[PDB]
Homo-oligomer: A and B are copies of this chain.
Amino acid sequence: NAMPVVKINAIEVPAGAGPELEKRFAHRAHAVENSPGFLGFQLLRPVKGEERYFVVTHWESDEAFQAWANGPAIAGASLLEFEVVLDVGG
């Protein structure tokens, strides 16, 4: 009954650096793929009305995201946080 959460990292990617960014995030999706509370990942290339790439992750709760984001690691971008008010499928 926790409130689902959606984090969107809006990143400025130069014109041309597209294929290298989408190759890079294909690996970063691996590290998040089986984390506790992880629901979904999407990489969104802007087409109209926006110029930044959108890195979207769906989580069970803000607690699950803070657990993954503040844990240990190996070593402009604006972060937008939302609460999934409702969700329907196709």
Query: Which residues of chain A have a CB within 8 Å of any CB of chain B?
Result: 5-6, 8, 22, 25-26, 29, 32-33, 38-50, 54, 58, 62, 78-90
Contact = CB atoms under 8 A, between A and B. Distances in A.
Contacts of A8: 50, 54
B50 A89 contact: no
Consensus secondary structure, chain A interface: strand
Given A42-B6, A89-B40, A89-B41, A82 B54 contact: yes
Contact of A42 (B22, B29, B84): B84
Contacts of A83: 44-45, 47
Nearest to A18: B85
Q: Which of A32, A39, A47, A79 has the most CB of B within 10 A?
A: A47
Contacts of A22: 85-86
